[PDB]
């Protein structure tokens, strides 16, 4: 990766979700949650599908909102639902990037 960059934003997502916890949590936590998605600029990949793009993009996105907030935020297992939604949303945010980037 030549660097991470922020491509395009999303916009309050508010997709279907699987369970209303994921929706409500995203909407109250919207302020802590991301407003956009970041991008792995490969200079020579040529062998990634959307499953590899979404994971590699995800794998950055997650750290940006798990390891960074580790500075001093003691959830104590409160992070379970935080990660539950944040996993789901980052995957969906990643799919949307392909669908505005096209």
mmCIF file of N, CA and C in Angstrom:
data_model
loop_
_atom_site.group_PDB
_atom_site.id
_atom_site.type_symbol
_atom_site.label_atom_id
_atom_site.label_comp_id
_atom_site.label_asym_id
_atom_site.label_seq_id
_atom_site.Cartn_x
_atom_site.Cartn_y
_atom_site.Cartn_z
ATOM 1 N N UNK A 1 0.858 -1.174 0.000
ATOM 2 C CA UNK A 1 0.000 0.000 0.000
ATOM 3 C C UNK A 1 0.905 1.238 0.000
ATOM 4 N N UNK A 2 0.703 2.139 -0.965
ATOM 5 C CA UNK A 2 1.485 3.366 -1.099
ATOM 6 C C UNK A 2 1.107 4.390 -0.032
ATOM 7 N N UNK A 3 -0.140 4.332 0.434
ATOM 8 C CA UNK A 3 -0.628 4.973 1.637
ATOM 9 C C UNK A 3 -2.120 4.694 1.767
ATOM 10 N N UNK A 4 -2.670 4.950 2.948
ATOM 11 C CA UNK A 4 -4.109 5.043 3.127
ATOM 12 C C UNK A 4 -4.520 6.445 2.683
ATOM 13 N N UNK A 5 -5.717 6.586 2.126
ATOM 14 C CA UNK A 5 -6.342 7.876 1.874
ATOM 15 C C UNK A 5 -7.834 7.747 2.149
ATOM 16 N N UNK A 6 -8.502 8.850 2.453
ATOM 17 C CA UNK A 6 -9.950 8.947 2.541
ATOM 18 C C UNK A 6 -10.478 9.277 1.156
ATOM 19 N N UNK A 7 -11.211 8.328 0.568
ATOM 20 C CA UNK A 7 -11.826 8.463 -0.738
ATOM 21 C C UNK A 7 -13.066 9.328 -0.621
ATOM 22 N N UNK A 8 -14.225 8.691 -0.456
ATOM 23 C CA UNK A 8 -15.511 9.368 -0.429
ATOM 24 C C UNK A 8 -16.213 9.006 0.872
ATOM 25 N N UNK A 9 -17.026 9.938 1.354
ATOM 26 C CA UNK A 9 -17.857 9.778 2.532
ATOM 27 C C UNK A 9 -19.042 8.850 2.240
ATOM 28 N N UNK A 10 -19.963 8.708 3.196
ATOM 29 C CA UNK A 10 -21.063 7.753 3.127
ATOM 30 C C UNK A 10 -22.377 8.542 3.255
ATOM 31 N N UNK A 11 -22.793 8.903 4.475
ATOM 32 C CA UNK A 11 -23.898 9.820 4.723
ATOM 33 C C UNK A 11 -24.958 9.237 5.640
ATOM 34 N N UNK A 12 -24.689 9.216 6.949
ATOM 35 C CA UNK A 12 -25.545 8.651 7.967
ATOM 36 C C UNK A 12 -26.005 7.215 7.742
ATOM 37 N N UNK A 13 -25.370 6.441 6.853
ATOM 38 C CA UNK A 13 -25.697 5.119 6.354
ATOM 39 C C UNK A 13 -27.163 4.686 6.522
ATOM 40 N N UNK A 14 -27.558 4.336 7.749
ATOM 41 C CA UNK A 14 -28.864 3.886 8.212
ATOM 42 C C UNK A 14 -29.516 2.795 7.341
ATOM 43 N N UNK A 15 -28.691 1.936 6.733
ATOM 44 C CA UNK A 15 -29.102 0.707 6.056
ATOM 45 C C UNK A 15 -30.006 -0.177 6.917
ATOM 46 N N UNK A 16 -30.508 -1.235 6.286
ATOM 47 C CA UNK A 16 -31.431 -2.219 6.832
ATOM 48 C C UNK A 16 -31.048 -2.634 8.257
ATOM 49 N N UNK A 17 -29.794 -3.063 8.432
ATOM 50 C CA UNK A 17 -29.276 -3.840 9.554
ATOM 51 C C UNK A 17 -30.057 -5.136 9.777
ATOM 52 N N UNK A 18 -29.426 -6.038 10.520
ATOM 53 C CA UNK A 18 -29.925 -7.383 10.800
ATOM 54 C C UNK A 18 -30.798 -7.364 12.047
ATOM 55 N N UNK A 19 -30.480 -6.456 12.972
ATOM 56 C CA UNK A 19 -31.126 -6.333 14.260
ATOM 57 C C UNK A 19 -31.196 -4.847 14.593
ATOM 58 N N UNK A 20 -32.259 -4.377 15.258
ATOM 59 C CA UNK A 20 -32.468 -2.961 15.502
ATOM 60 C C UNK A 20 -31.458 -2.389 16.499
ATOM 61 N N UNK A 21 -30.843 -3.211 17.363
ATOM 62 C CA UNK A 21 -29.716 -2.800 18.192
ATOM 63 C C UNK A 21 -28.632 -2.187 17.324
ATOM 64 N N UNK A 22 -28.326 -2.808 16.185
ATOM 65 C CA UNK A 22 -27.210 -2.380 15.355
ATOM 66 C C UNK A 22 -27.517 -0.998 14.776
ATOM 67 N N UNK A 23 -28.766 -0.797 14.361
ATOM 68 C CA UNK A 23 -29.270 0.454 13.832
ATOM 69 C C UNK A 23 -29.261 1.545 14.902
ATOM 70 N N UNK A 24 -29.937 1.328 16.032
ATOM 71 C CA UNK A 24 -30.045 2.302 17.106
ATOM 72 C C UNK A 24 -28.656 2.643 17.577
ATOM 73 N N UNK A 25 -27.832 1.640 17.870
ATOM 74 C CA UNK A 25 -26.511 1.893 18.367
ATOM 75 C C UNK A 25 -25.784 2.783 17.377
ATOM 76 N N UNK A 26 -25.758 2.427 16.089
ATOM 77 C CA UNK A 26 -25.103 3.251 15.077
ATOM 78 C C UNK A 26 -25.605 4.689 15.109
ATOM 79 N N UNK A 27 -26.895 4.898 15.346
ATOM 80 C CA UNK A 27 -27.496 6.212 15.258
ATOM 81 C C UNK A 27 -27.211 7.084 16.466
ATOM 82 N N UNK A 28 -27.167 6.503 17.665
ATOM 83 C CA UNK A 28 -26.802 7.249 18.867
ATOM 84 C C UNK A 28 -25.295 7.471 18.883
ATOM 85 N N UNK A 29 -24.530 6.449 18.492
ATOM 86 C CA UNK A 29 -23.064 6.455 18.503
ATOM 87 C C UNK A 29 -22.498 7.084 17.245
ATOM 88 N N UNK A 30 -23.351 7.586 16.359
ATOM 89 C CA UNK A 30 -23.026 8.173 15.075
ATOM 90 C C UNK A 30 -21.870 9.178 15.161
ATOM 91 N N UNK A 31 -21.846 9.940 16.262
ATOM 92 C CA UNK A 31 -20.844 10.953 16.569
ATOM 93 C C UNK A 31 -19.451 10.353 16.812
ATOM 94 N N UNK A 32 -19.369 9.172 17.435
ATOM 95 C CA UNK A 32 -18.108 8.464 17.633
ATOM 96 C C UNK A 32 -17.761 7.631 16.404
ATOM 97 N N UNK A 33 -18.769 7.103 15.720
ATOM 98 C CA UNK A 33 -18.624 6.316 14.510
ATOM 99 C C UNK A 33 -18.038 7.175 13.370
ATOM 100 N N UNK A 34 -17.475 6.552 12.325
ATOM 101 C CA UNK A 34 -16.882 7.281 11.202
ATOM 102 C C UNK A 34 -17.948 7.949 10.327
ATOM 103 N N UNK A 35 -17.597 8.997 9.563
ATOM 104 C CA UNK A 35 -18.533 9.652 8.632
ATOM 105 C C UNK A 35 -18.222 9.295 7.177
ATOM 106 N N UNK A 36 -17.170 8.508 6.959
ATOM 107 C CA UNK A 36 -16.584 8.210 5.666
ATOM 108 C C UNK A 36 -15.785 6.920 5.752
ATOM 109 N N UNK A 37 -15.182 6.469 4.656
ATOM 110 C CA UNK A 37 -14.377 5.255 4.641
ATOM 111 C C UNK A 37 -12.978 5.592 4.084
ATOM 112 N N UNK A 38 -11.923 4.889 4.523
ATOM 113 C CA UNK A 38 -10.556 5.076 4.021
ATOM 114 C C UNK A 38 -10.291 3.988 2.962
ATOM 115 N N UNK A 39 -9.219 4.102 2.174
ATOM 116 C CA UNK A 39 -8.915 3.278 1.012
ATOM 117 C C UNK A 39 -7.440 2.841 0.987
ATOM 118 N N UNK A 40 -7.125 1.542 0.813
ATOM 119 C CA UNK A 40 -5.779 1.068 0.496
ATOM 120 C C UNK A 40 -5.433 1.380 -0.965
ATOM 121 N N UNK A 41 -4.613 2.405 -1.240
ATOM 122 C CA UNK A 41 -4.099 2.575 -2.600
ATOM 123 C C UNK A 41 -2.932 1.614 -2.820
ATOM 124 N N UNK A 42 -3.220 0.547 -3.549
ATOM 125 C CA UNK A 42 -2.219 -0.338 -4.116
ATOM 126 C C UNK A 42 -1.659 0.356 -5.353
ATOM 127 N N UNK A 43 -0.364 0.209 -5.623
ATOM 128 C CA UNK A 43 0.265 0.648 -6.876
ATOM 129 C C UNK A 43 0.449 -0.506 -7.852
ATOM 130 N N UNK A 44 0.207 -1.708 -7.365
ATOM 131 C CA UNK A 44 0.386 -2.962 -8.058
ATOM 132 C C UNK A 44 -0.180 -4.053 -7.171
ATOM 133 N N UNK A 45 -1.496 -4.202 -7.221
ATOM 134 C CA UNK A 45 -2.271 -5.306 -6.694
ATOM 135 C C UNK A 45 -2.615 -6.199 -7.880
ATOM 136 N N UNK A 46 -3.528 -5.747 -8.740
ATOM 137 C CA UNK A 46 -4.100 -6.426 -9.900
ATOM 138 C C UNK A 46 -4.703 -7.816 -9.629
ATOM 139 N N UNK A 47 -4.805 -8.274 -8.381
ATOM 140 C CA UNK A 47 -5.266 -9.608 -8.013
ATOM 141 C C UNK A 47 -6.078 -9.579 -6.708
ATOM 142 N N UNK A 48 -6.952 -8.586 -6.575
ATOM 143 C CA UNK A 48 -7.931 -8.442 -5.498
ATOM 144 C C UNK A 48 -9.337 -8.404 -6.103
ATOM 145 N N UNK A 49 -10.244 -9.116 -5.443
ATOM 146 C CA UNK A 49 -11.688 -9.074 -5.607
ATOM 147 C C UNK A 49 -12.278 -8.322 -4.414
ATOM 148 N N UNK A 50 -13.588 -8.101 -4.428
ATOM 149 C CA UNK A 50 -14.279 -7.248 -3.466
ATOM 150 C C UNK A 50 -14.160 -7.808 -2.049
ATOM 151 N N UNK A 51 -14.029 -9.120 -1.913
ATOM 152 C CA UNK A 51 -13.799 -9.805 -0.652
ATOM 153 C C UNK A 51 -12.437 -9.438 -0.057
ATOM 154 N N UNK A 52 -11.384 -9.365 -0.873
ATOM 155 C CA UNK A 52 -10.056 -8.922 -0.469
ATOM 156 C C UNK A 52 -10.000 -7.410 -0.275
ATOM 157 N N UNK A 53 -10.669 -6.621 -1.114
ATOM 158 C CA UNK A 53 -10.720 -5.176 -0.925
ATOM 159 C C UNK A 53 -11.433 -4.893 0.390
ATOM 160 N N UNK A 54 -12.632 -5.456 0.593
ATOM 161 C CA UNK A 54 -13.412 -5.173 1.783
ATOM 162 C C UNK A 54 -12.645 -5.608 3.018
ATOM 163 N N UNK A 55 -11.982 -6.774 3.051
ATOM 164 C CA UNK A 55 -11.224 -7.126 4.245
ATOM 165 C C UNK A 55 -10.048 -6.177 4.433
ATOM 166 N N UNK A 56 -9.264 -5.831 3.411
ATOM 167 C CA UNK A 56 -8.030 -5.076 3.644
ATOM 168 C C UNK A 56 -8.381 -3.649 4.061
ATOM 169 N N UNK A 57 -9.406 -3.072 3.428
ATOM 170 C CA UNK A 57 -9.994 -1.795 3.790
ATOM 171 C C UNK A 57 -10.539 -1.865 5.222
ATOM 172 N N UNK A 58 -11.346 -2.892 5.527
ATOM 173 C CA UNK A 58 -11.895 -3.163 6.851
ATOM 174 C C UNK A 58 -10.779 -3.179 7.874
ATOM 175 N N UNK A 59 -9.704 -3.934 7.626
ATOM 176 C CA UNK A 59 -8.611 -4.209 8.560
ATOM 177 C C UNK A 59 -7.913 -2.920 8.995
ATOM 178 N N UNK A 60 -7.920 -1.893 8.139
ATOM 179 C CA UNK A 60 -7.497 -0.557 8.520
ATOM 180 C C UNK A 60 -8.592 0.158 9.298
ATOM 181 N N UNK A 61 -9.784 0.285 8.710
ATOM 182 C CA UNK A 61 -10.939 0.932 9.319
ATOM 183 C C UNK A 61 -11.105 0.501 10.787
ATOM 184 N N UNK A 62 -11.156 -0.801 11.072
ATOM 185 C CA UNK A 62 -11.299 -1.320 12.425
ATOM 186 C C UNK A 62 -10.226 -0.750 13.342
ATOM 187 N N UNK A 63 -8.946 -0.866 12.990
ATOM 188 C CA UNK A 63 -7.864 -0.384 13.832
ATOM 189 C C UNK A 63 -8.060 1.103 14.139
ATOM 190 N N UNK A 64 -8.453 1.890 13.132
ATOM 191 C CA UNK A 64 -8.687 3.324 13.243
ATOM 192 C C UNK A 64 -9.770 3.660 14.273
ATOM 193 N N UNK A 65 -10.590 2.680 14.665
ATOM 194 C CA UNK A 65 -11.686 2.855 15.598
ATOM 195 C C UNK A 65 -11.730 1.759 16.664
ATOM 196 N N UNK A 66 -10.622 1.063 16.907
ATOM 197 C CA UNK A 66 -10.464 0.112 18.001
ATOM 198 C C UNK A 66 -9.174 0.439 18.737
ATOM 199 N N UNK A 67 -8.058 0.480 18.014
ATOM 200 C CA UNK A 67 -6.755 0.672 18.620
ATOM 201 C C UNK A 67 -6.624 2.147 18.996
ATOM 202 N N UNK A 68 -7.026 3.076 18.123
ATOM 203 C CA UNK A 68 -7.046 4.500 18.446
ATOM 204 C C UNK A 68 -7.887 4.793 19.681
ATOM 205 N N UNK A 69 -9.169 4.408 19.747
ATOM 206 C CA UNK A 69 -9.947 4.631 20.950
ATOM 207 C C UNK A 69 -9.422 3.854 22.165
ATOM 208 N N UNK A 70 -8.418 2.976 22.037
ATOM 209 C CA UNK A 70 -7.819 2.327 23.194
ATOM 210 C C UNK A 70 -7.030 3.297 24.070
ATOM 211 N N UNK A 71 -6.753 4.530 23.612
ATOM 212 C CA UNK A 71 -5.932 5.525 24.310
ATOM 213 C C UNK A 71 -6.277 5.545 25.802
ATOM 214 N N UNK A 72 -7.562 5.722 26.123
ATOM 215 C CA UNK A 72 -8.072 5.563 27.478
ATOM 216 C C UNK A 72 -9.594 5.562 27.475
ATOM 217 N N UNK A 73 -10.200 4.486 26.963
ATOM 218 C CA UNK A 73 -11.639 4.261 26.924
ATOM 219 C C UNK A 73 -11.893 2.820 27.351
ATOM 220 N N UNK A 74 -12.245 2.658 28.628
ATOM 221 C CA UNK A 74 -12.501 1.380 29.283
ATOM 222 C C UNK A 74 -13.979 1.010 29.112
ATOM 223 N N UNK A 75 -14.331 0.286 28.055
ATOM 224 C CA UNK A 75 -15.662 -0.252 27.806
ATOM 225 C C UNK A 75 -16.008 -1.371 28.782
ATOM 226 N N UNK A 76 -15.055 -2.256 29.058
ATOM 227 C CA UNK A 76 -15.246 -3.537 29.705
ATOM 228 C C UNK A 76 -16.431 -4.296 29.117
ATOM 229 N N UNK A 77 -16.211 -4.925 27.960
ATOM 230 C CA UNK A 77 -17.133 -5.825 27.272
ATOM 231 C C UNK A 77 -18.315 -5.081 26.655
ATOM 232 N N UNK A 78 -18.538 -3.825 27.035
ATOM 233 C CA UNK A 78 -19.346 -2.886 26.272
ATOM 234 C C UNK A 78 -18.832 -2.765 24.830
ATOM 235 N N UNK A 79 -17.561 -3.101 24.547
ATOM 236 C CA UNK A 79 -17.082 -3.039 23.184
ATOM 237 C C UNK A 79 -17.641 -4.142 22.310
ATOM 238 N N UNK A 80 -18.262 -5.169 22.878
ATOM 239 C CA UNK A 80 -18.785 -6.271 22.109
ATOM 240 C C UNK A 80 -19.771 -5.786 21.061
ATOM 241 N N UNK A 81 -20.795 -5.030 21.466
ATOM 242 C CA UNK A 81 -21.803 -4.528 20.534
ATOM 243 C C UNK A 81 -21.166 -3.421 19.693
ATOM 244 N N UNK A 82 -20.270 -2.620 20.276
ATOM 245 C CA UNK A 82 -19.542 -1.579 19.555
ATOM 246 C C UNK A 82 -18.820 -2.163 18.343
ATOM 247 N N UNK A 83 -18.052 -3.236 18.531
ATOM 248 C CA UNK A 83 -17.397 -3.981 17.460
ATOM 249 C C UNK A 83 -18.431 -4.683 16.582
ATOM 250 N N UNK A 84 -19.500 -5.261 17.142
ATOM 251 C CA UNK A 84 -20.526 -5.970 16.380
ATOM 252 C C UNK A 84 -21.017 -5.055 15.259
ATOM 253 N N UNK A 85 -21.547 -3.886 15.618
ATOM 254 C CA UNK A 85 -22.053 -2.927 14.653
ATOM 255 C C UNK A 85 -20.911 -2.409 13.803
ATOM 256 N N UNK A 86 -19.780 -2.040 14.405
ATOM 257 C CA UNK A 86 -18.705 -1.382 13.677
ATOM 258 C C UNK A 86 -18.141 -2.301 12.599
ATOM 259 N N UNK A 87 -18.083 -3.603 12.844
ATOM 260 C CA UNK A 87 -17.688 -4.597 11.864
ATOM 261 C C UNK A 87 -18.659 -4.539 10.675
ATOM 262 N N UNK A 88 -19.957 -4.708 10.958
ATOM 263 C CA UNK A 88 -21.031 -4.739 9.974
ATOM 264 C C UNK A 88 -21.003 -3.456 9.139
ATOM 265 N N UNK A 89 -20.987 -2.297 9.811
ATOM 266 C CA UNK A 89 -21.053 -1.021 9.132
ATOM 267 C C UNK A 89 -19.829 -0.817 8.252
ATOM 268 N N UNK A 90 -18.605 -1.078 8.722
ATOM 269 C CA UNK A 90 -17.403 -0.853 7.920
ATOM 270 C C UNK A 90 -17.492 -1.690 6.637
ATOM 271 N N UNK A 91 -17.938 -2.951 6.710
ATOM 272 C CA UNK A 91 -18.126 -3.801 5.531
ATOM 273 C C UNK A 91 -19.098 -3.144 4.550
ATOM 274 N N UNK A 92 -20.221 -2.622 5.032
ATOM 275 C CA UNK A 92 -21.232 -1.960 4.215
ATOM 276 C C UNK A 92 -20.738 -0.628 3.633
ATOM 277 N N UNK A 93 -20.006 0.160 4.418
ATOM 278 C CA UNK A 93 -19.375 1.405 4.009
ATOM 279 C C UNK A 93 -18.391 1.120 2.885
ATOM 280 N N UNK A 94 -17.729 -0.027 2.952
ATOM 281 C CA UNK A 94 -16.766 -0.429 1.959
ATOM 282 C C UNK A 94 -17.462 -0.777 0.639
ATOM 283 N N UNK A 95 -18.563 -1.536 0.698
ATOM 284 C CA UNK A 95 -19.385 -1.831 -0.476
ATOM 285 C C UNK A 95 -19.880 -0.521 -1.107
ATOM 286 N N UNK A 96 -20.342 0.442 -0.302
ATOM 287 C CA UNK A 96 -20.847 1.691 -0.856
ATOM 288 C C UNK A 96 -19.750 2.424 -1.624
ATOM 289 N N UNK A 97 -18.486 2.335 -1.187
ATOM 290 C CA UNK A 97 -17.407 3.054 -1.840
ATOM 291 C C UNK A 97 -17.338 2.603 -3.297
ATOM 292 N N UNK A 98 -17.403 1.290 -3.541
ATOM 293 C CA UNK A 98 -17.392 0.715 -4.883
ATOM 294 C C UNK A 98 -18.552 1.216 -5.746
ATOM 295 N N UNK A 99 -19.655 1.598 -5.114
ATOM 296 C CA UNK A 99 -20.923 1.952 -5.746
ATOM 297 C C UNK A 99 -21.131 3.455 -5.904
ATOM 298 N N UNK A 100 -20.240 4.265 -5.345
ATOM 299 C CA UNK A 100 -20.060 5.684 -5.690
ATOM 300 C C UNK A 100 -18.830 5.925 -6.543
ATOM 301 N N UNK A 101 -17.818 5.106 -6.323
ATOM 302 C CA UNK A 101 -16.594 5.038 -7.102
ATOM 303 C C UNK A 101 -16.835 4.425 -8.479
ATOM 304 N N UNK A 102 -18.021 3.859 -8.702
ATOM 305 C CA UNK A 102 -18.556 3.504 -10.004
ATOM 306 C C UNK A 102 -19.785 4.368 -10.308
#
